[PDB]
Amino acid sequence: VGAXAXVXWXWXWXGX
Protein backbone atom coordinates (compact mmCIF):
# COMPACT_ATOMS: atom_id res chain seq x y z
CA VAL A 1 0.00 0.00 0.00
CA GLY A 2 0.92 3.73 -0.46
CA ALA A 3 2.78 4.50 -3.76
CA UNK A 4 4.02 2.48 -6.77
CA ALA A 5 1.99 -0.80 -7.11
CA UNK A 6 -0.84 -2.03 -4.79
CA VAL A 7 -3.51 0.08 -2.94
CA UNK A 8 -2.31 3.73 -3.37
CA TRP A 9 -0.71 5.90 -6.12
CA UNK A 10 0.42 4.41 -9.50
CA TRP A 11 -0.47 0.73 -10.32
CA UNK A 12 -3.21 -1.61 -9.00
CA TRP A 13 -5.97 0.36 -7.14
CA UNK A 14 -6.63 4.00 -6.04
CA GLY A 15 -4.55 6.91 -7.49
CA UNK A 16 -2.48 7.81 -10.60
Add this chain to the structure above:
Amino acid sequence: VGAXAXVXWXWXWXGX
Protein backbone atom coordinates in the same frame (compact mmCIF):
# COMPACT_ATOMS: atom_id res chain seq x y z
CA VAL B 1 6.06 -2.41 -4.59
CA GLY B 2 7.76 1.07 -4.45
CA ALA B 3 6.92 3.11 -1.28
CA UNK B 4 4.76 2.59 1.85
CA ALA B 5 4.22 -1.19 2.51
CA UNK B 6 5.54 -4.12 0.37
CA VAL B 7 8.89 -4.37 -1.56
CA UNK B 8 10.32 -0.78 -1.45
CA TRP B 9 10.57 2.12 1.07
CA UNK B 10 8.83 1.97 4.52
CA TRP B 11 7.19 -1.35 5.65
CA UNK B 12 7.75 -5.00 4.60
CA TRP B 13 11.07 -5.41 2.67
CA UNK B 14 13.89 -3.14 1.30
CA GLY B 15 14.19 0.53 2.47
CA UNK B 16 13.27 2.79 5.43
